Amino acid sequence: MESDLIDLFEGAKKAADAAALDGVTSSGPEVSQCIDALKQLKKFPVTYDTLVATQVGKKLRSLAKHPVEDIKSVATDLLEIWKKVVI
Protein backbone atom coordinates (compact mmCIF):
# COMPACT_ATOMS: atom_id res chain seq x y z
CA MET A 1 0.00 0.00 0.00
CA GLU A 2 1.03 3.62 -0.49
CA SER A 3 0.45 4.40 3.17
CA ASP A 4 3.05 1.79 4.10
CA LEU A 5 5.48 3.25 1.54
CA ILE A 6 5.03 6.73 3.02
CA ASP A 7 5.41 5.48 6.60
CA LEU A 8 8.57 3.48 5.87
CA PHE A 9 10.13 6.41 4.03
CA GLU A 10 9.24 8.72 6.91
CA GLY A 11 11.00 6.38 9.32
CA ALA A 12 14.04 6.19 7.05
CA LYS A 13 14.26 9.97 6.68
CA LYS A 14 13.79 10.59 10.41
CA ALA A 15 16.64 8.16 11.08
CA ALA A 16 18.99 9.53 8.42
CA ASP A 17 18.29 13.07 9.63
CA ALA A 18 18.87 12.35 13.31
CA ALA A 19 22.10 10.66 12.23
CA ALA A 20 23.23 13.71 10.26
CA LEU A 21 22.23 16.21 12.96
CA ASP A 22 23.57 14.22 15.93
CA GLY A 23 26.86 13.50 14.15
CA VAL A 24 26.45 9.72 14.23
CA THR A 25 29.03 7.42 12.66
CA SER A 26 28.34 4.30 10.59
CA SER A 27 28.30 2.23 13.79
CA GLY A 28 25.42 4.29 15.21
CA PRO A 29 21.89 3.04 15.84
CA GLU A 30 20.22 5.72 13.71
CA VAL A 31 22.25 4.56 10.71
CA SER A 32 21.12 0.98 11.34
CA GLN A 33 17.46 1.99 11.55
CA CYS A 34 17.74 3.98 8.32
CA ILE A 35 19.47 1.04 6.62
CA ASP A 36 16.73 -1.38 7.65
CA ALA A 37 13.94 1.00 6.65
CA LEU A 38 15.56 1.43 3.23
CA LYS A 39 15.95 -2.33 2.80
CA GLN A 40 12.27 -3.07 3.46
CA LEU A 41 11.36 -0.49 0.83
CA LYS A 42 13.20 -2.53 -1.81
CA LYS A 43 10.53 -5.25 -1.63
CA PHE A 44 7.70 -2.76 -2.27
CA PRO A 45 6.21 -3.28 -5.77
CA VAL A 46 6.15 0.43 -6.57
CA THR A 47 4.50 1.66 -9.77
CA TYR A 48 4.86 4.89 -11.70
CA ASP A 49 1.59 6.38 -10.42
CA THR A 50 2.64 5.39 -6.90
CA LEU A 51 5.82 7.43 -7.31
CA VAL A 52 3.79 10.34 -8.68
CA ALA A 53 1.28 10.33 -5.82
CA THR A 54 3.76 9.68 -3.00
CA GLN A 55 6.92 11.32 -4.44
CA VAL A 56 8.96 8.89 -2.31
CA GLY A 57 11.20 8.25 -5.30
CA LYS A 58 12.02 11.95 -5.58
CA LYS A 59 12.46 12.27 -1.82
CA LEU A 60 14.97 9.40 -1.81
CA ARG A 61 17.52 11.46 -3.77
CA SER A 62 18.24 13.37 -0.55
CA LEU A 63 19.12 10.13 1.23
CA ALA A 64 21.20 9.26 -1.86
CA LYS A 65 23.19 12.41 -1.03
CA HIS A 66 23.51 11.66 2.70
CA PRO A 67 26.86 12.40 4.39
CA VAL A 68 27.01 8.86 5.84
CA GLU A 69 28.28 6.57 3.11
CA ASP A 70 26.34 3.50 4.28
CA ILE A 71 23.00 5.31 4.00
CA LYS A 72 24.01 6.88 0.69
CA SER A 73 25.04 3.51 -0.78
CA VAL A 74 21.88 1.69 0.29
CA ALA A 75 19.72 4.58 -0.96
CA THR A 76 21.46 4.42 -4.34
CA ASP A 77 20.78 0.67 -4.41
CA LEU A 78 17.10 1.18 -3.54
CA LEU A 79 16.80 3.76 -6.32
CA GLU A 80 18.53 1.37 -8.74
CA ILE A 81 15.96 -1.34 -8.01
CA TRP A 82 12.94 0.95 -8.18
CA LYS A 83 14.34 2.35 -11.45
CA LYS A 84 14.20 -1.02 -13.22
CA VAL A 85 10.79 -1.66 -11.68
CA VAL A 86 9.03 1.50 -12.84
CA ILE A 87 10.44 1.94 -16.34
Side-chain angles (χ1 to χ4, degrees), residues 7-23 28-77:
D7 288 3
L8 263 176
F9 171 79
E10 290 185 312
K13 159 166 185 55
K14 148 167 204 169
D17 282 355
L21 253 179
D22 297 355
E30 283 97 332
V31 178
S32 302
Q33 293 166 8
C34 184
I35 300 276
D36 298 334
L38 289 173
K39 308 235 175 171
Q40 317 192 39
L41 279 157
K42 278 156 167 179
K43 322 210 140 271
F44 258 95
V46 302
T47 63
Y48 164 64
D49 298 302
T50 287
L51 292 189
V52 190
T54 74
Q55 290 291 302
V56 157
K58 174 104 225 154
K59 299 201 261 242
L60 276 174
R61 311 292 200 168
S62 195
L63 265 57
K65 312 186 261 246
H66 203 265
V68 166
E69 193 93 65
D70 281 9
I71 287 145
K72 190 199 192 251
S73 289
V74 170
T76 297
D77 285 10

Short mmCIF file of all heavy atoms in Angstrom, two decimals, residues 7-77, unseen atoms left out:
data_model
loop_
_atom_site.label_atom_id
_atom_site.label_comp_id
_atom_site.label_asym_id
_atom_site.label_seq_id
_atom_site.Cartn_x
_atom_site.Cartn_y
_atom_site.Cartn_z
N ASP A 7 4.98 5.66 5.21
CA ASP A 7 5.41 5.48 6.60
C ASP A 7 6.85 4.99 6.67
O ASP A 7 7.65 5.49 7.48
CB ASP A 7 4.49 4.48 7.30
CG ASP A 7 3.12 5.06 7.58
OD1 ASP A 7 2.87 6.22 7.19
OD2 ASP A 7 2.29 4.36 8.21
N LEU A 8 7.21 4.00 5.85
CA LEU A 8 8.57 3.48 5.87
C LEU A 8 9.56 4.55 5.44
O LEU A 8 10.64 4.68 6.03
CB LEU A 8 8.68 2.26 4.95
CG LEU A 8 8.57 0.91 5.65
CD1 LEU A 8 8.61 -0.19 4.56
CD2 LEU A 8 9.67 0.70 6.65
N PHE A 9 9.21 5.35 4.43
CA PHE A 9 10.13 6.41 4.03
C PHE A 9 10.27 7.45 5.13
O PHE A 9 11.35 8.02 5.32
CB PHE A 9 9.68 7.09 2.75
CG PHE A 9 10.48 8.31 2.44
CD1 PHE A 9 11.74 8.20 1.88
CD2 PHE A 9 10.01 9.57 2.77
CE1 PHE A 9 12.49 9.32 1.61
CE2 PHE A 9 10.76 10.69 2.51
CZ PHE A 9 12.01 10.56 1.94
N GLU A 10 9.17 7.76 5.82
CA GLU A 10 9.24 8.72 6.91
C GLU A 10 10.17 8.23 8.01
O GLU A 10 10.99 8.99 8.53
CB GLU A 10 7.85 8.99 7.48
CG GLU A 10 6.94 9.78 6.56
CD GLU A 10 5.60 10.12 7.22
OE1 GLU A 10 4.97 9.21 7.81
OE2 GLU A 10 5.17 11.29 7.13
N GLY A 11 10.06 6.95 8.36
CA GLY A 11 11.00 6.38 9.32
C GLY A 11 12.44 6.49 8.85
O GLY A 11 13.32 6.92 9.59
N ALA A 12 12.68 6.12 7.59
CA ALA A 12 14.04 6.19 7.05
C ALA A 12 14.59 7.60 7.10
O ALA A 12 15.75 7.81 7.48
CB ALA A 12 14.04 5.67 5.61
N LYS A 13 13.78 8.59 6.72
CA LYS A 13 14.26 9.97 6.68
C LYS A 13 14.49 10.50 8.09
O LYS A 13 15.49 11.18 8.34
CB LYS A 13 13.27 10.86 5.93
CG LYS A 13 13.41 12.35 6.24
CD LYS A 13 12.66 13.20 5.21
CE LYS A 13 12.87 14.70 5.43
NZ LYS A 13 14.31 15.09 5.45
N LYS A 14 13.57 10.22 9.02
CA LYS A 14 13.79 10.59 10.41
C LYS A 14 15.13 10.05 10.90
O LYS A 14 15.91 10.76 11.54
CB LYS A 14 12.64 10.06 11.26
CG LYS A 14 13.03 9.67 12.68
CD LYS A 14 11.80 9.48 13.55
CE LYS A 14 12.10 9.68 15.03
NZ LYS A 14 10.85 9.73 15.83
N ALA A 15 15.40 8.77 10.61
CA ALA A 15 16.64 8.16 11.08
C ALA A 15 17.86 8.81 10.44
O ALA A 15 18.79 9.22 11.14
CB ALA A 15 16.61 6.65 10.82
N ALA A 16 17.87 8.91 9.11
CA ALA A 16 18.99 9.53 8.42
C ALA A 16 19.24 10.95 8.94
O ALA A 16 20.39 11.38 9.08
CB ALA A 16 18.72 9.57 6.91
N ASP A 17 18.16 11.67 9.25
CA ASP A 17 18.29 13.07 9.63
C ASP A 17 18.78 13.22 11.06
O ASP A 17 19.60 14.09 11.34
CB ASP A 17 16.94 13.76 9.43
CG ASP A 17 16.68 14.08 7.96
OD1 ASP A 17 17.58 13.85 7.13
OD2 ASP A 17 15.58 14.55 7.62
N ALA A 18 18.29 12.38 11.98
CA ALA A 18 18.87 12.35 13.31
C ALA A 18 20.35 11.97 13.25
O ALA A 18 21.17 12.51 14.01
CB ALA A 18 18.11 11.38 14.21
N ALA A 19 20.71 11.06 12.35
CA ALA A 19 22.10 10.66 12.23
C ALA A 19 22.97 11.81 11.73
O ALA A 19 24.10 11.99 12.19
CB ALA A 19 22.22 9.45 11.30
N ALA A 20 22.45 12.59 10.78
CA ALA A 20 23.23 13.71 10.26
C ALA A 20 23.31 14.86 11.26
O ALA A 20 24.33 15.54 11.33
CB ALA A 20 22.64 14.21 8.94
N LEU A 21 22.24 15.09 12.03
CA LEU A 21 22.23 16.21 12.96
C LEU A 21 22.95 15.89 14.26
O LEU A 21 23.55 16.78 14.86
CB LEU A 21 20.79 16.62 13.27
CG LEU A 21 20.26 17.91 12.66
CD1 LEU A 21 18.78 18.10 13.07
CD2 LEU A 21 21.10 19.10 13.05
N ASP A 22 22.90 14.64 14.71
CA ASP A 22 23.57 14.22 15.93
C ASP A 22 25.01 13.77 15.69
O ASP A 22 25.66 13.29 16.61
CB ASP A 22 22.78 13.10 16.61
CG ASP A 22 21.40 13.54 17.05
OD1 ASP A 22 21.08 14.74 16.91
OD2 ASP A 22 20.64 12.68 17.54
N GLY A 23 25.50 13.90 14.46
CA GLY A 23 26.86 13.50 14.15
C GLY A 23 27.14 12.05 14.49
O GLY A 23 28.09 11.75 15.23
N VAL A 24 26.33 11.14 13.95
CA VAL A 24 26.45 9.72 14.23
C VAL A 24 27.31 9.07 13.15
O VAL A 24 27.20 9.40 11.97
CB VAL A 24 25.06 9.06 14.30
N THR A 25 28.17 8.14 13.58
CA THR A 25 29.03 7.42 12.66
C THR A 25 28.29 6.21 12.09
O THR A 25 27.13 5.93 12.43
CB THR A 25 30.32 6.98 13.36
N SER A 26 28.97 5.46 11.21
CA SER A 26 28.34 4.30 10.59
C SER A 26 27.91 3.26 11.62
O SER A 26 26.95 2.52 11.39
CB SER A 26 29.30 3.67 9.57
N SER A 27 28.61 3.19 12.74
CA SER A 27 28.30 2.23 13.79
C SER A 27 27.19 2.71 14.73
O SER A 27 27.00 2.10 15.79
CB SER A 27 29.55 1.92 14.61
N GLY A 28 26.46 3.76 14.36
CA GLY A 28 25.42 4.29 15.21
C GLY A 28 24.08 3.63 14.98
O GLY A 28 23.81 3.05 13.92
N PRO A 29 23.20 3.71 15.98
CA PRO A 29 21.89 3.04 15.84
C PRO A 29 20.99 3.70 14.80
O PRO A 29 20.23 3.01 14.11
CB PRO A 29 21.28 3.11 17.25
CG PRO A 29 22.42 3.55 18.17
CD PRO A 29 23.37 4.34 17.31
N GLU A 30 21.04 5.03 14.70
CA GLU A 30 20.22 5.72 13.71
C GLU A 30 20.56 5.25 12.30
O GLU A 30 19.66 5.05 11.47
CB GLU A 30 20.40 7.23 13.83
CG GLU A 30 19.66 7.85 15.00
CD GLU A 30 20.54 8.05 16.22
OE1 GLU A 30 21.51 7.28 16.39
OE2 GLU A 30 20.26 8.97 17.02
N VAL A 31 21.85 5.08 12.01
CA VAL A 31 22.25 4.56 10.71
C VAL A 31 21.64 3.19 10.48
O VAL A 31 21.12 2.90 9.40
CB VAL A 31 23.78 4.53 10.59
CG1 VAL A 31 24.20 3.94 9.26
CG2 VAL A 31 24.37 5.92 10.77
N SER A 32 21.67 2.32 11.50
CA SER A 32 21.12 0.98 11.34
C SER A 32 19.62 1.02 11.06
O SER A 32 19.11 0.28 10.21
CB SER A 32 21.41 0.14 12.58
OG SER A 32 22.80 0.07 12.84
N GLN A 33 18.90 1.88 11.78
CA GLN A 33 17.46 1.99 11.55
C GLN A 33 17.17 2.50 10.14
O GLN A 33 16.26 1.99 9.47
CB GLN A 33 16.83 2.92 12.60
CG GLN A 33 16.89 2.36 14.01
CD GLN A 33 16.59 3.40 15.07
OE1 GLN A 33 16.19 4.52 14.76
NE2 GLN A 33 16.78 3.02 16.33
N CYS A 34 17.92 3.50 9.69
CA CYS A 34 17.74 3.98 8.32
C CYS A 34 18.03 2.88 7.31
O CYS A 34 17.29 2.71 6.33
CB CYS A 34 18.64 5.19 8.07
SG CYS A 34 18.42 5.94 6.43
N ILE A 35 19.10 2.12 7.53
CA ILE A 35 19.47 1.04 6.62
C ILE A 35 18.33 0.04 6.52
O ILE A 35 17.90 -0.34 5.42
CB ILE A 35 20.77 0.37 7.10
CG1 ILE A 35 21.93 1.38 7.16
CG2 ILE A 35 21.10 -0.84 6.22
CD1 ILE A 35 22.64 1.57 5.83
N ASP A 36 17.81 -0.41 7.66
CA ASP A 36 16.73 -1.38 7.65
C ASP A 36 15.50 -0.83 6.94
O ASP A 36 14.91 -1.50 6.08
CB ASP A 36 16.37 -1.79 9.09
CG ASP A 36 17.52 -2.46 9.81
OD1 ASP A 36 18.39 -3.04 9.13
OD2 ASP A 36 17.55 -2.40 11.06
N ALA A 37 15.10 0.40 7.29
CA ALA A 37 13.94 1.00 6.65
C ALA A 37 14.12 1.04 5.14
O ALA A 37 13.18 0.76 4.39
CB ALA A 37 13.72 2.41 7.20
N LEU A 38 15.32 1.38 4.67
CA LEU A 38 15.56 1.43 3.23
C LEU A 38 15.53 0.04 2.61
O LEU A 38 15.15 -0.10 1.44
CB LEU A 38 16.89 2.11 2.95
CG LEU A 38 16.95 3.61 3.20
CD1 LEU A 38 18.39 4.10 3.05
CD2 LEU A 38 16.02 4.35 2.27
N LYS A 39 15.94 -0.98 3.36
CA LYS A 39 15.95 -2.33 2.80
C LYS A 39 14.54 -2.89 2.66
O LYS A 39 14.25 -3.58 1.68
CB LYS A 39 16.79 -3.27 3.67
CG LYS A 39 18.17 -2.76 3.95
CD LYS A 39 19.21 -3.78 3.54
CE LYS A 39 20.63 -3.25 3.71
NZ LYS A 39 21.65 -4.33 3.51
N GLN A 40 13.65 -2.62 3.62
CA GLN A 40 12.27 -3.07 3.46
C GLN A 40 11.63 -2.44 2.23
O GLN A 40 10.84 -3.09 1.53
CB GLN A 40 11.45 -2.74 4.71
CG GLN A 40 12.11 -3.02 6.04
CD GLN A 40 11.11 -2.93 7.18
OE1 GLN A 40 9.96 -3.36 7.06
NE2 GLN A 40 11.55 -2.35 8.30
N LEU A 41 11.96 -1.18 1.96
CA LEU A 41 11.36 -0.49 0.83
C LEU A 41 11.69 -1.18 -0.49
O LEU A 41 10.91 -1.10 -1.44
CB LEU A 41 11.82 0.97 0.78
CG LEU A 41 11.10 1.93 1.72
CD1 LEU A 41 11.98 3.16 2.00
CD2 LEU A 41 9.75 2.34 1.17
N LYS A 42 12.84 -1.85 -0.57
CA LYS A 42 13.20 -2.53 -1.81
C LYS A 42 12.11 -3.49 -2.26
O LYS A 42 11.80 -3.58 -3.46
CB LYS A 42 14.52 -3.28 -1.63
CG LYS A 42 15.77 -2.43 -1.78
CD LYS A 42 16.94 -3.06 -1.02
CE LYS A 42 18.26 -2.42 -1.40
NZ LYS A 42 19.42 -3.00 -0.66
N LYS A 43 11.51 -4.22 -1.32
CA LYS A 43 10.53 -5.25 -1.63
C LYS A 43 9.18 -4.68 -2.05
O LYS A 43 8.31 -5.44 -2.48
CB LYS A 43 10.35 -6.15 -0.40
CG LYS A 43 11.66 -6.41 0.36
CD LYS A 43 11.65 -7.76 1.05
CE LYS A 43 13.02 -8.42 0.93
NZ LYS A 43 13.13 -9.25 -0.32
N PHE A 44 8.99 -3.37 -1.96
CA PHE A 44 7.70 -2.76 -2.27
C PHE A 44 7.50 -2.72 -3.77
O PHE A 44 8.32 -2.13 -4.48
CB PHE A 44 7.64 -1.36 -1.68
CG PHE A 44 6.85 -1.28 -0.41
CD1 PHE A 44 7.48 -1.36 0.82
CD2 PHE A 44 5.47 -1.14 -0.44
CE1 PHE A 44 6.74 -1.30 1.99
CE2 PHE A 44 4.74 -1.07 0.72
CZ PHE A 44 5.37 -1.15 1.94
N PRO A 45 6.43 -3.32 -4.31
CA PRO A 45 6.21 -3.28 -5.77
C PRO A 45 5.68 -1.93 -6.23
O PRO A 45 4.52 -1.76 -6.60
CB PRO A 45 5.20 -4.43 -5.98
CG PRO A 45 4.40 -4.45 -4.70
CD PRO A 45 5.34 -4.01 -3.59
N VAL A 46 6.56 -0.92 -6.20
CA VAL A 46 6.15 0.43 -6.57
C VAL A 46 5.77 0.46 -8.05
O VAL A 46 6.27 -0.32 -8.87
CB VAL A 46 7.26 1.45 -6.26
CG1 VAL A 46 7.61 1.41 -4.78
CG2 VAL A 46 8.48 1.18 -7.10
N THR A 47 4.87 1.38 -8.39
CA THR A 47 4.50 1.66 -9.77
C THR A 47 4.72 3.14 -10.04
O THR A 47 4.94 3.94 -9.13
CB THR A 47 3.05 1.26 -10.05
OG1 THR A 47 2.17 2.04 -9.23
CG2 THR A 47 2.84 -0.22 -9.75
N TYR A 48 4.64 3.50 -11.32
CA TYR A 48 4.86 4.89 -11.70
C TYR A 48 3.88 5.82 -10.98
O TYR A 48 4.30 6.78 -10.33
CB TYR A 48 4.72 5.05 -13.22
CG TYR A 48 4.55 6.48 -13.67
CD1 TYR A 48 5.55 7.42 -13.46
CD2 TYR A 48 3.38 6.90 -14.29
CE1 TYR A 48 5.39 8.73 -13.86
CE2 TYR A 48 3.21 8.20 -14.70
CZ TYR A 48 4.22 9.12 -14.49
OH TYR A 48 4.06 10.42 -14.89
N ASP A 49 2.58 5.53 -11.08
CA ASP A 49 1.59 6.38 -10.42
C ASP A 49 1.81 6.44 -8.92
O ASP A 49 1.53 7.47 -8.29
CB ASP A 49 0.17 5.90 -10.74
CG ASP A 49 -0.15 5.96 -12.22
OD1 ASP A 49 -0.08 7.07 -12.80
OD2 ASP A 49 -0.46 4.90 -12.80
N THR A 50 2.29 5.35 -8.32
CA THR A 50 2.64 5.39 -6.90
C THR A 50 3.72 6.44 -6.65
O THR A 50 3.63 7.23 -5.71
CB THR A 50 3.10 4.01 -6.43
OG1 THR A 50 1.97 3.14 -6.33
CG2 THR A 50 3.77 4.12 -5.07
N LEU A 51 4.74 6.47 -7.51
CA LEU A 51 5.82 7.43 -7.31
C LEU A 51 5.36 8.85 -7.62
O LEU A 51 5.94 9.82 -7.11
CB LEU A 51 7.02 7.07 -8.18
CG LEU A 51 7.75 5.78 -7.78
CD1 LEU A 51 9.05 5.63 -8.59
CD2 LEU A 51 8.04 5.72 -6.29
N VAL A 52 4.34 9.01 -8.45
CA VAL A 52 3.79 10.34 -8.68
C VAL A 52 3.01 10.81 -7.45
O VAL A 52 3.18 11.94 -6.98
CB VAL A 52 2.90 10.37 -9.94
CG1 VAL A 52 2.53 11.81 -10.31
CG2 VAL A 52 3.58 9.67 -11.10
N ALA A 53 2.16 9.94 -6.91
CA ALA A 53 1.28 10.33 -5.82
C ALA A 53 2.06 10.52 -4.52
O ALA A 53 1.76 11.43 -3.74
CB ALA A 53 0.18 9.29 -5.63
N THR A 54 3.04 9.65 -4.26
CA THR A 54 3.76 9.68 -3.00
C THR A 54 5.04 10.51 -3.06
O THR A 54 5.46 11.05 -2.03
CB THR A 54 4.12 8.25 -2.56
OG1 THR A 54 5.20 7.76 -3.37
CG2 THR A 54 2.92 7.33 -2.71
N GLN A 55 5.67 10.61 -4.23
CA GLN A 55 6.92 11.32 -4.44
C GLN A 55 8.08 10.71 -3.66
O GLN A 55 9.15 11.32 -3.56
CB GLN A 55 6.79 12.80 -4.08
CG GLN A 55 5.93 13.63 -5.04
CD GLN A 55 6.58 13.81 -6.40
OE1 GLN A 55 7.68 14.34 -6.51
NE2 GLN A 55 5.88 13.38 -7.45
N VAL A 56 7.91 9.51 -3.11
CA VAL A 56 8.96 8.89 -2.31
C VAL A 56 10.22 8.70 -3.14
O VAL A 56 11.35 8.85 -2.65
CB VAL A 56 8.46 7.55 -1.72
CG1 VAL A 56 9.64 6.62 -1.39
CG2 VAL A 56 7.57 7.81 -0.50
N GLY A 57 10.05 8.37 -4.42
CA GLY A 57 11.20 8.25 -5.30
C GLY A 57 12.01 9.53 -5.35
O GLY A 57 13.23 9.52 -5.18
N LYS A 58 11.33 10.66 -5.60
CA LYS A 58 12.02 11.95 -5.58
C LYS A 58 12.68 12.19 -4.23
O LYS A 58 13.84 12.60 -4.15
CB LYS A 58 11.03 13.07 -5.89
CG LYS A 58 11.61 14.47 -5.75
CD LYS A 58 11.90 15.08 -7.11
CE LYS A 58 13.26 15.76 -7.15
NZ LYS A 58 13.80 15.79 -8.55
N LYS A 59 11.94 11.97 -3.14
CA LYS A 59 12.46 12.27 -1.82
C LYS A 59 13.64 11.39 -1.44
O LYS A 59 14.37 11.72 -0.50
CB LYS A 59 11.35 12.13 -0.77
CG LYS A 59 10.17 13.07 -0.96
CD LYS A 59 9.39 13.23 0.34
CE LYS A 59 8.15 12.35 0.35
NZ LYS A 59 6.90 13.16 0.45
N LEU A 60 13.84 10.27 -2.13
CA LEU A 60 14.97 9.40 -1.81
C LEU A 60 16.30 9.93 -2.33
O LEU A 60 17.35 9.47 -1.88
CB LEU A 60 14.73 8.00 -2.37
CG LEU A 60 13.88 7.08 -1.51
CD1 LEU A 60 13.63 5.78 -2.33
CD2 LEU A 60 14.54 6.76 -0.20
N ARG A 61 16.27 10.88 -3.28
CA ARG A 61 17.52 11.46 -3.77
C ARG A 61 18.30 12.11 -2.63
O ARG A 61 19.53 12.01 -2.56
CB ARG A 61 17.22 12.49 -4.86
CG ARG A 61 16.28 11.98 -5.94
CD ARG A 61 16.93 10.90 -6.78
NE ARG A 61 16.28 10.72 -8.07
CZ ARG A 61 16.78 10.01 -9.08
NH1 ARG A 61 17.95 9.40 -8.98
NH2 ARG A 61 16.08 9.91 -10.21
N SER A 62 17.59 12.78 -1.72
CA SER A 62 18.24 13.37 -0.55
C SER A 62 19.04 12.33 0.21
O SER A 62 20.23 12.52 0.49
CB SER A 62 17.19 14.02 0.36
OG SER A 62 17.80 14.88 1.30
N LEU A 63 18.40 11.21 0.56
CA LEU A 63 19.12 10.13 1.23
C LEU A 63 20.28 9.63 0.38
O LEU A 63 21.33 9.26 0.91
CB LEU A 63 18.17 8.98 1.55
CG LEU A 63 17.58 9.00 2.96
CD1 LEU A 63 16.86 10.32 3.19
CD2 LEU A 63 16.65 7.83 3.18
N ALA A 64 20.11 9.62 -0.95
CA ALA A 64 21.20 9.26 -1.86
C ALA A 64 22.32 10.28 -1.86
O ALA A 64 23.37 10.02 -2.45
CB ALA A 64 20.66 9.08 -3.27
N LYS A 65 22.11 11.45 -1.25
CA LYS A 65 23.19 12.41 -1.03
C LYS A 65 23.49 12.60 0.46
O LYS A 65 23.92 13.68 0.88
CB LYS A 65 22.85 13.76 -1.67
CG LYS A 65 22.35 13.68 -3.10
CD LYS A 65 22.17 15.07 -3.70
CE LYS A 65 20.71 15.50 -3.65
NZ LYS A 65 20.12 15.65 -5.01
N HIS A 66 23.27 11.57 1.27
CA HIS A 66 23.51 11.66 2.70
C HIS A 66 25.01 11.70 2.99
O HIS A 66 25.81 11.11 2.25
CB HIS A 66 22.87 10.48 3.42
CG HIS A 66 22.57 10.73 4.86
ND1 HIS A 66 23.44 10.37 5.88
CD2 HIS A 66 21.50 11.29 5.47
CE1 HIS A 66 22.92 10.72 7.04
NE2 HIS A 66 21.74 11.27 6.82
N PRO A 67 25.43 12.38 4.06
CA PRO A 67 26.86 12.40 4.39
C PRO A 67 27.40 11.04 4.81
O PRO A 67 28.58 10.76 4.56
CB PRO A 67 26.96 13.42 5.54
CG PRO A 67 25.69 14.23 5.46
CD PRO A 67 24.64 13.28 4.92
N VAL A 68 26.58 10.20 5.45
CA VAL A 68 27.01 8.86 5.84
C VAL A 68 27.00 7.97 4.61
O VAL A 68 25.98 7.85 3.93
CB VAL A 68 26.11 8.30 6.95
CG1 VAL A 68 26.34 6.81 7.11
CG2 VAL A 68 26.35 9.03 8.26
N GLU A 69 28.14 7.33 4.35
CA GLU A 69 28.28 6.57 3.11
C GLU A 69 27.41 5.33 3.09
O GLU A 69 26.98 4.91 2.01
CB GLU A 69 29.74 6.17 2.90
CG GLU A 69 30.05 5.67 1.50
CD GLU A 69 30.55 6.77 0.59
OE1 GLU A 69 31.63 7.33 0.86
OE2 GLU A 69 29.84 7.08 -0.39
N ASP A 70 27.18 4.70 4.24
CA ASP A 70 26.34 3.50 4.28
C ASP A 70 24.93 3.83 3.82
O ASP A 70 24.37 3.15 2.94
CB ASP A 70 26.32 2.91 5.70
CG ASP A 70 27.56 2.10 6.00
OD1 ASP A 70 28.51 2.14 5.18
OD2 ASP A 70 27.61 1.47 7.08
N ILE A 71 24.34 4.89 4.38
CA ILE A 71 23.00 5.31 4.00
C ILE A 71 22.96 5.69 2.53
O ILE A 71 22.05 5.31 1.79
CB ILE A 71 22.54 6.47 4.91
CG1 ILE A 71 22.22 5.93 6.31
CG2 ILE A 71 21.35 7.19 4.30
CD1 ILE A 71 22.56 6.89 7.43
N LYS A 72 23.95 6.47 2.09
CA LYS A 72 24.01 6.88 0.69
C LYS A 72 24.06 5.68 -0.24
O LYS A 72 23.34 5.64 -1.25
CB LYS A 72 25.24 7.77 0.48
CG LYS A 72 25.34 8.48 -0.87
CD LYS A 72 26.79 8.94 -1.12
CE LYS A 72 26.91 9.89 -2.28
NZ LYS A 72 27.56 9.27 -3.47
N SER A 73 24.89 4.69 0.07
CA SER A 73 25.04 3.51 -0.78
C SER A 73 23.74 2.73 -0.85
O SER A 73 23.29 2.34 -1.94
CB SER A 73 26.17 2.64 -0.25
OG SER A 73 27.43 3.25 -0.49
N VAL A 74 23.11 2.48 0.30
CA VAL A 74 21.88 1.69 0.29
C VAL A 74 20.75 2.46 -0.39
O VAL A 74 19.89 1.87 -1.05
CB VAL A 74 21.50 1.27 1.72
CG1 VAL A 74 20.11 0.67 1.75
CG2 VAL A 74 22.54 0.29 2.26
N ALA A 75 20.74 3.79 -0.27
CA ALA A 75 19.72 4.58 -0.96
C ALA A 75 19.92 4.52 -2.47
O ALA A 75 18.95 4.40 -3.23
CB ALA A 75 19.76 6.03 -0.46
N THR A 76 21.18 4.61 -2.92
CA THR A 76 21.46 4.42 -4.34
C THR A 76 20.98 3.05 -4.82
O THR A 76 20.42 2.93 -5.91
CB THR A 76 22.96 4.59 -4.60
OG1 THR A 76 23.35 5.92 -4.27
CG2 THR A 76 23.27 4.32 -6.05
N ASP A 77 21.21 2.01 -4.01
CA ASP A 77 20.78 0.67 -4.41
C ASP A 77 19.25 0.59 -4.50
O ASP A 77 18.70 0.00 -5.44
CB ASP A 77 21.31 -0.37 -3.43
CG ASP A 77 22.79 -0.65 -3.62
OD1 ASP A 77 23.45 0.10 -4.38
OD2 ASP A 77 23.30 -1.61 -3.01
#
